[PDB]
Amino acid sequence: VEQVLSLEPQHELKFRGPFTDVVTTNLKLGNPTDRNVCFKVKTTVPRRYCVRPNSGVIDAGASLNVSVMLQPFDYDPNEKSKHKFMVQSMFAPPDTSDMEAVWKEAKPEDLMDSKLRCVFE
């Protein structure tokens, strides 16, 4: 199922040092359609990043800049990959603003997944 959002970057999030401090990089999500689109940002290491906003609605025709903040470290050595992100999107149903139940209700063909890899430079 094709991602209707535009992503910039679309494949790799690049984080430049120093890695003793937070490193913020941008993820721009653009909605070229005539419908509002809900989105969620997920990662394999949620304790290592602060992502703002991490979910929400992008109105028809609008873009949103998501701040992805790599923290210096966390206390979770049992986190598998520190390096994978995913943007999940779905159209907002017309008469709906309780996004939580929408996501639960969603059929797999209604969910659009875009994966990204983090690279530390």
Binding site: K40, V41, K42, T43, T44, P46, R47, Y49, C50, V51, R52, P53, N54, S55, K80, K84, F85, M86
Partner: peptide
Amino acid sequence: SFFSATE
């Protein structure tokens, strides 16, 4: 494997 990111 993927978890909701937090702010």
